[PDB]
């Protein structure tokens, strides 16, 4: 095993070993960790950066915390670590809107300290293909190809190529029909130069990075699937995702250099 | 008149005035001029650069010269200047193949001096759209969109954007059907932000540059139209060209910054 990625109380501070933020190289967490020891009127408002961590040390949480918002807003984090009553919050790389927050209640002493986190919103385009035809959407894509414009029984590609020493982008698609395979948790291998098959594989195995954040959304019969990549990849990786609506089909090919 | 471009014996050495290479600013010719005064065995072989000039001073040419090749090759120049028996040759910016040459016969004294020019071939991609479906072609395009893949009665764009301080590129298309308008001598104006018409205009007026070289080719029912641009343009210019095959149509939009 050449396990080499970031570590946040994951299984192979330390206690088969957990790792706070066969060769198993441990990378020191690439982001800032914000620790709270348990502000104005028993509540604490905190702005988090994309990927920034927030750890709370509190042994009293009477119900599920940081799983709901303290206003008309749901700030969803993909990693809410619960261990030895030391909850861990990982700020996402994508969010539906700026008007979003999450709440946690820590019963410290005989007072309810409630934490509220907000995002330092940054307008982010998705490097990918929009195969839908609605001009109304909360998502912006680098490429577009309205699948309704393609002929029945035809197959057309929409290519996306990424070429940066270090990456920090969102890759995804918008499909008004069926997505093949279950993108982006599983992607379709690139085409061979020889007469060889192309299989469905997990994206994690193809890119070979840990905690690859995956995001999703839906706006009518339009499905949005996305994923975030932060850092340099070991090798130039390519993969595909198919969108298909009735007799029309279009496929997104993605090539990421390094 | 603010006539401001290159000059090669054109009408408004000097003799309403001709100009060897109302405000009329004369720009000194942006390329090297090669003069022959009239080599091995009464013939001269010369390699020319893209845009380089070659002037022959000879008062005796019994028939049309530099209009035909001295081998299985036709090296076509868009500007063959005939004035005061001082023929001028302007090397093109596009050529079908490397195996190409042109011949001229100068009756100097009592000996036939025959000039032969060849190109310093450089593999050049065309910034534009290939709407055809044949993999066999002598031309390479930056973008492709096989029009046979588009649905009947649908209209899809293929965009090309150029962004360089100084340009030296070929812009064009390959259409398997009808080209609208007569591209690239005349192009279709860009789309208005308001409810205003878009007209057919000459490309020369849109880009505002002199001697914009235009090239063409055909491979079966596939029509290739191209044009060359060398230098910085006064302002960010955009224009369109439509390709249409039966009920299918696709349009190339071109935006050139500066």
């Amino acid at each position: 095993c050449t396990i080499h990625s970031y570590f946040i109380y994951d299984k192979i501070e330390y206690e088969t070993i957990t790792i706070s933020p066969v060769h198993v190289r441990v990378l020191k967490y690439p982001h800032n960790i914000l620790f709270t020891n348990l502000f104005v009127s028993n509540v604490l408002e905190v702005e988090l950066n994309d990927g920034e961590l927030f750890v709370l040390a509190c042994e009293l949480i009477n119900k599920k915390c940081f799983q709901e918002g303290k206003e008309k807003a749901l700030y969803k984090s993909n990693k809410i670590i619960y261990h030895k009553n030391l909850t861990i919050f990982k700020a996402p790389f994508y969010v539906t809107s700026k008007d979003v927050n999450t709440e946690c209640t820590c019963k410290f002493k005989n007072n309810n300290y409630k934490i509220v986190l907000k995002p330092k919103y940054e307008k982010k385009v998705i490097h990918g293909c929009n195969f839908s035809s609605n001009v109304s959407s909360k998502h912006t894509f680098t490429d577009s190809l309205d699948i309704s414009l393609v002929d029945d029984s035809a197959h057309i590609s929409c290519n996306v190529h990424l070429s940066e020493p270090k990456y920090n982008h969102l890759v995804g698609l918008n499909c008004p029909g069926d997505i093949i395979p279950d993108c982006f948790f599983q992607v379709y291998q690139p085409e061979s130069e020889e007469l060889e098959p192309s299989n469905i594989v997990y994206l994690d195995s193809q890119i070979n990075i840990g905690d690859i954040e995956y995001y999703e959304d839906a706006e009518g019969d339009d499905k949005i699937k996305l994923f975030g990549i932060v850092g340099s990849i070991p090798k130039t990786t390519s993969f595909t995702c198919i969108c298909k609506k009735d007799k029309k089909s279009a496929y997104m090919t993605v090539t990421i250099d390094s | 008149c603010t006539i401001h471009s290159y000059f090669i014996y054109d009408k408004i050495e000097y003799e309403t005035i001709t100009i060897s290479p109302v405000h009329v600013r004369v720009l000194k010719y942006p390329h090297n001029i090669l003069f022959t005064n009239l080599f091995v065995s009464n013939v001269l072989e010369v390699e020319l650069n893209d845009g380089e000039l070659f002037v022959l001073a000879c008062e005796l040419i019994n028939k049309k010269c530099f209009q035909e090749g001295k081998e299985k090759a036709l090296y076509k120049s868009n500007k063959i200047i005939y004035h005061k028996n001082l023929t001028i040759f302007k090397a093109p910016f596009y050529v079908t193949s490397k195996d190409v040459n042109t011949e001229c016969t100068c009756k100097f004294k009592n000996n036939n001096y025959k000039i032969v020019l060849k190109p310093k071939y450089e593999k050049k991609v065309i910034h534009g759209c290939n709407f055809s479906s044949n993999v066999s072609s002598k031309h390479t395009f930056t973008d492709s969109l096989d029009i046979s893949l588009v649905d009947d009665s649908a209209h899809i764009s293929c965009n090309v954007h150029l962004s360089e301080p100084k340009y030296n590129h070929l812009v064009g298309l390959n259409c398997p059907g009808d080209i609208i308008p007569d591209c690239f001598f005349q192009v279709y104006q860009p789309e208005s932000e308001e409810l205003e018409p878009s007209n057919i205009v000459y490309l020369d007026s849109q880009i505002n540059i002199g001697d914009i070289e235009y090239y063409e080719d055909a491979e079966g029912d596939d029509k290739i139209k191209l044009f060359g641009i060398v230098g910085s343009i006064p302002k960010t210019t955009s224009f369109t060209c439509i390709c249409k095959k039966d009920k299918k149509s696709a349009y190339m939009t071109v935006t050139i910054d500066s």
Partner: single-chain antibody
Amino acid sequence: TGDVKLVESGGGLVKLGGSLKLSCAASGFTFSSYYMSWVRQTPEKRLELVAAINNNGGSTYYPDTVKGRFTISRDNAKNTLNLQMNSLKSEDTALYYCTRQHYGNLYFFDYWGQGTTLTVSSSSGGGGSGGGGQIVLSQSPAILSASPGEKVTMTCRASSSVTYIHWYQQKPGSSPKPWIQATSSLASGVPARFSGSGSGTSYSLSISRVEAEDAATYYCQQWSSNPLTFGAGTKLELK
């Protein structure tokens, strides 16, 4: 011109050991953008890949049962597909379909021609001289006799892991037709009562309420490693 069309020509009767050339005329699509295959159907109704060629025609594949006897070729300028068949055996007696796949459709055989018959000529029937050094597909049951309005399920088991299965439906007198693409994505026009599911070595096709229209042979197909293989088929019956 028009919609996708594949016309197979040649075929008839050849003595054992003889030679024969088959041809396929493709029209209604950009032929050079598709992978082409010759897929035969034995008298036992087994489907077998005979040969495949890539888009440009530079890469070919032949299963060991035909390797060294058959030769696949394409002429992208003429829109034709050819198969030169040498040293013909009794095993080669089959209806030869010309069919297409695209890398972008997960190599799904979305169009098949009507087929050209070859009769090379003691008795036989079963198996198909295949099943060796390949992922084999085991379909169950062979005959599913169900009553209308019943929920039915047919299984497709694979000798070893396959990352997806394609389903095809065939009614007598016509070639196979796309039914379920990449395990669970129904083909165009396929009723909502149909569903497809699975992973690893176990896959299935289910019908929520069976009707007279569903009566057909359903084949599963895998392409996770060479050669590409199909199962034997589950004949759906409503007597």
